[PDB]
Design a protein around this nucleic acid. Structure first.
Lengths: 72, 127, 99, 144, 186, 139, 55
RNA sequence: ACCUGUCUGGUUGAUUCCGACAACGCGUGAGGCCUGGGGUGCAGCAGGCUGUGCGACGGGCGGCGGCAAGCUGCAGGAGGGCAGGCGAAAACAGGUCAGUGAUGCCCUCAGAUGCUCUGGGCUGCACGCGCACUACAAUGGCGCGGCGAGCGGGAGUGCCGGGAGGCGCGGGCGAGGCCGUGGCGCAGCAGGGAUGGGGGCCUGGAAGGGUGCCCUGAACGAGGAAUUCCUAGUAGCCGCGGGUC
């Protein structure tokens, strides 16, 4: 079984995962990379971008893991 | 004026501490202040001693701790022993002694190695 | 300025030497420094026991350790010579530096 | 919020054909360029830094303009200010000019190497013609 | 004094009377790492804290031997994801993982004579805790090896799924597999 | 220099490296973008401004060696900048740093007057003491 | 249903390895005193959990 | 011939001891011992050094056993089986004649089985096997910043170079890693570094040796029957230094 998770964004998953992280309480960068077929590298920068917007507050800034939860 | 020196040590990590009657409480371990320690486990293993003894006993006591030798984690327990040993040695010299016996009983019941050395050394086998 | 340097492998001999020399030095001078003992320079040799390859890794460790003692003062050269005559019934190696 | 999202590209070619090699657009350019036979992880760091394309771009997202900025960067790296000692095939036996072999050039040099050696009865290619380990290696216990 | 400066060890209720003796919930350090000589006194594994007993179970399979600072950093992260996914005290969800993963009864071979018969055997509370630690630290490591899951997530995945008994967690599907072999022979 | 330590170490570094780049007192070599920085390293440094960031790290090491009242050279300094070399099937042995760029990065610290030699050892001078003093005042 | 059992008496380490010991077990509310084989490390004063549903 | 002593039982790491005893007394070994390790008393002197002592005996207490030896838990304590060292009698057709100006005997001694020189081999390779190394990666790898050991205490310095390396002065050292952070992101992939090509050097009289640079990028995705080692600062992981040179 060979997996190569897509390193692209197709303007339909970005609003899909934004709806998904607004649903969930806490999401992490590898968890969206498995639930969807994204690279965790592009998944990392998406959740930082949704931290830059008012979509999710940054929890813990560590190099091993960056944790994210929904705002308010 | 008032200054005591006590040493604590882990495996081969030796740590001096100097307790003085300074202006405000401060712990500058290895010429680095406690809030700006890069290793947080170095900082928290100092802080739980302050949490156990309580901050009221550290009113004006300035601790200039230095450490050398050993690795990262044995340096944590070197200064942690040396910080508490110099704290009780200051009260034994410059303060009232029944509080020092009160403090020593508090720490020894807390953890034995805060005030006594861990005799557990690197004891290598042969071939 | 005299530096009396003495080195020895046996310790019960080199402690008898420094004891009778300090019994000799207090007769001379009261500003004589106490006997200072430098680092015991020690060495080990690890050696296989077997003269062949039939045995287990049986390693015998032999050790040598030489003990150093020193004295420092500022005296007269005739006193240095009568110090020098005193320490020749001793098997401790003796060397002196006048700087 | 896709439109305000900027960092990673939307559409990427999955594979790129260059220098008779297929290089995946999924990899970033320094890691993508090393699929070329003759370009390692050190040479590709040199080429991207000397040419000046963005290393933080996936390779399929590159335009054709910067892609031809890379293929000439591969072909003559001495043009793009790369020092001599980082070259593949430098101080040549025949022409004596420092060069950097890419792709089929290495094996065609290698096929030439065994062919010229078997003519000259060279021992080192004779063991390589039989697949034997030809450097200082031991061949009793390992390599079997 | 609080674990990781966040979580109180005092408000952690181990409901099992069997394991209350051995799960150690006395606040001795902000970190799990207490380099105490408790293994020598023959029962002192019930005296080092349960989180220190847990992080020692992580540093496993050779390449991670002795990397306790890596493990309890990867548990410091693992308690933040746990607490903000569940609201519970992450020590309380940790002790509820082990009481839901320690096998109470086991299958073993007993015979005084040369013939040995496989019989059901009751499990000691300290062994029940020792192999509850072992089964979840196996399932944490084996689920995070060659996948996109990290070490800090697989702790959070297993200990949540162990605290609410479900066949997803590696502990309880191995705990119930062990206890089924007890009923297989009794 | 007690007040050297009373700021964050890495936060001092880009404040120091950005000072050495803005004042132009450290000069880049020709091959700066491709230096392995050790023979144990596998890649060149990924940072484009790695050269300044090291010049802040070297000048900090001379700063603390003055605080320890100790003299430091270039060859001993390269040992602080060595990694462990992946030696293939052999065990990974520690190797020394690249001495060549460290020597030129200290010579530019001599031209600025930050580092003045004392005998055969270069030492931090009073000019290096003052210019750090406005930096850590600002951090 | 699981019955918790307190160990008052330990004797007769048995089995191949010797880990298994027979322990005389007290039940709390009843007080019924029963021998049982327990595998791991046991101390007098521990409480063990039994689920045999037969004894 | 032999047996008892040298043991019914209990005990101990110990034929260690308690005890009953046709045995009684002894002796080796065991122990005692010697060295290192931790605690501190004094003394001397200047990554502190080394002399002299003290400190633990299983002493105290509780329960078993009671002429008991002892066992076991706790307190006190720095410490309650620390690590080594020497190591009985008897053996073995154990190994070493290739450590020997240790050697009997046999064989060889001028076309030598002597010595020495040069070259080659001991490094050959369809294959079988032992022990290790590096791995199969995300608990990872790579890039920077920060913090960084002990044994060993000789070595750093300035300049040239991209590195290896070079040159000139010359009392004079510190690791993997860990922490912080950036990239990669489950891929035979930035895992792995085998094999091979081209160049630069070091040592040496002489490279198949070592090192450095670039490139090529193998098997290996957890390993069959089997099988080794290990109880606490230990296994394991991780480097470092010394012998060889």
């Amino acid at each position: 079984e060979a997996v190569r998770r897509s390193v692209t964004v197709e303007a339909d998953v970005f609003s899909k995962i934004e709806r998904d992280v607004a649903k969930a309480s806490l999401v992490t960068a590898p968890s969206v990379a498995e639930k969807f077929n994204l690279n965790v590298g592009v998944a990392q920068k998406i959740l930082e971008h949704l931290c830059a917007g008012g979509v999710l507050c940054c929890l813990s800034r560590n190099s091993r893991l960056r944790l994210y939860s929904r705002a308010q | 004026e008032k200054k005591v020196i006590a040493i604590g040590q882990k495996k081969t990590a030796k740590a001096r501490s100097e307790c003085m009657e300074g202006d405000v409480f401060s712990v500058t371990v290895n010429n680095v202040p406690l809030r700006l320690l890069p290793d947080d486990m170095m900082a928290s293993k100092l802080r739980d001693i302050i949490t156990r003894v309580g901050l009221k006993y550290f009113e004006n006591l300035v601790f200039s701790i230095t450490v050398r030798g050993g690795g990262p984690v044995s340096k944590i327990y070197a200064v942690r022993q040396a910080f508490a040993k110099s704290l009780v040695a200051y009260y034994g010299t410059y303060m009232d002694e029944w509080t020092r016996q009160e403090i020593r009983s508090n720490l020894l019941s807390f953890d034995k190695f805060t005030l006594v050395a861990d005799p557990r050394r690197a004891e290598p086998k042969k071939y | 300025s005299v530096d009396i340097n003495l080195e020895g492998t046996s310790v019960e001999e080199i402690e008898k030497v420094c004891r009778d020399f300090y019994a000799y030095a207090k007769t001379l001078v009261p500003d004589m420094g106490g006997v200072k003992r430098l680092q015991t320079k020690k060495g080990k040799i690890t050696t296989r026991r077997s003269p062949c390859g039939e045995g287990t890794n049986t390693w015998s460790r032999y050790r040598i350790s030489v003990h150093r003692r020193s004295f420092s003062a500022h005296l007269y050269p005739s006193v240095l010579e009568k110090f020098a005559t005193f320490l020749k019934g001793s098997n401790v190696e003796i060397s002196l530096v006048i700087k | 919020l896709f439109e305000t999202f900027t960092s990673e590209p939307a559409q990427i070619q999955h594979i790129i054909r260059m220098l008779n090699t297929n290089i995946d657009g999924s990899r970033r350019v320094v890691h993508a360029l090393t699929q070329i036979k003759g370009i390692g992880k050190r040479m590709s760091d040199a080429i991207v830094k000397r040419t000046g394309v963005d290393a933080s771009k996936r390779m399929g997202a590159l335009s054709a303009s910067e892609l031809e900025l890379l293929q000439d960067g591969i072909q003559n790296p001495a043009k793009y200010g790369i020092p001599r000692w980082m070259f593949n095939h430098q101080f040549d036996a025949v022409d004596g000019t420092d060069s950097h072999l890419i792709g089929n050039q290495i094996d065609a040099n290698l096929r030439f190497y065994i062919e010229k050696g078997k003519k000259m009865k060279h021992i080192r290619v004779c063991r390589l013609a039989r697949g034997l380990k030809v450097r200082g290696q031991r061949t009793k216990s390992n390599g079997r | 004094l609080l674990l990781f400066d966040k979580y109180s060890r005092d408000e952690v209720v181990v409901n099992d009377r069997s394991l209350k003796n051995y799960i150690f919930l006395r606040s001795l350090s902000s970190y799990p790492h207490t380099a105490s000589r408790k293994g020598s006194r023959q029962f002192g594994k019930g005296e080092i804290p349960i989180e220190e007993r847990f992080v020692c179970g992580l540093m496993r399979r050779g390449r991670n031997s002795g990397k306790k600072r890596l493990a309890m950093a990867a548990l410091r992260n693992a308690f933040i994801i746990i607490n903000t996914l569940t609201g519970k005290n992450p020590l309380q969800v940790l002790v509820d993982a082990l009481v839901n993963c320690g096998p109470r009864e086991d299958c073993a071979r007993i015979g005084k004579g040369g013939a040995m018969k496989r019989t059901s055997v009751d499990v000691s509370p300290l062994r029940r805790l020792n192999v509850a630690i072992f089964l979840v630290c196996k399932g944490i490591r084996q689920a995070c090896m060659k996948s996109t899951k990290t070490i800090a997530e697989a702790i959070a995945d297993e200990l949540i799924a162990a605290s609410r008994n479900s066949p997803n967690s590696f502990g309880v599907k191995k705990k119930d597999e062990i206890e089924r072999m007890a009923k297989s022979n009794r | 220099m007690k007040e050297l330590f009373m700021v964050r170490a890495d936060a001092l570094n880009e404040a120091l490296a950005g000072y050495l780049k803005s004042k132009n007192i450290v000069k880049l070599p020709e091959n700066f973008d491709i230096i392995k920085t050790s023979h144990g390293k596998q890649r060149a440094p990924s940072d484009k401004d790695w050269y300044y960031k090291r010049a802040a790290s070297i000048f900090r090491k001379l700063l603390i060696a003055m605080h320890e009242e100790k003299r430091i050279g270039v060859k001993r300094l390269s040992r602080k900048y060595g990694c462990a070399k992946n030696r293939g099937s052999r065990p990974s042995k520690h190797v020394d740093g690249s001495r060549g760029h460290i020597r030129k990065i200290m010579q530019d610290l001599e031209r600025a007057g930050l580092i003045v030699k004392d005998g055969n050892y270069r030492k931090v001078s009073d000019m290096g003491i003052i210019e750090t003093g406005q930096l850590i005042s600002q951090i | 249903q699981v019955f918790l059992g307190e160990v008052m008496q330990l004797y007769n380490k048995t089995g191949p390895g010797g880990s298994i010991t027979l322990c005389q077990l007290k039940l709390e509310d009843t007080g019924r005193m029963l021998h049982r084989a327990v595998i791991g490390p046991i101390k007098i004063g521990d409480v063990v959990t039994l689920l045999d549903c037969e004894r």
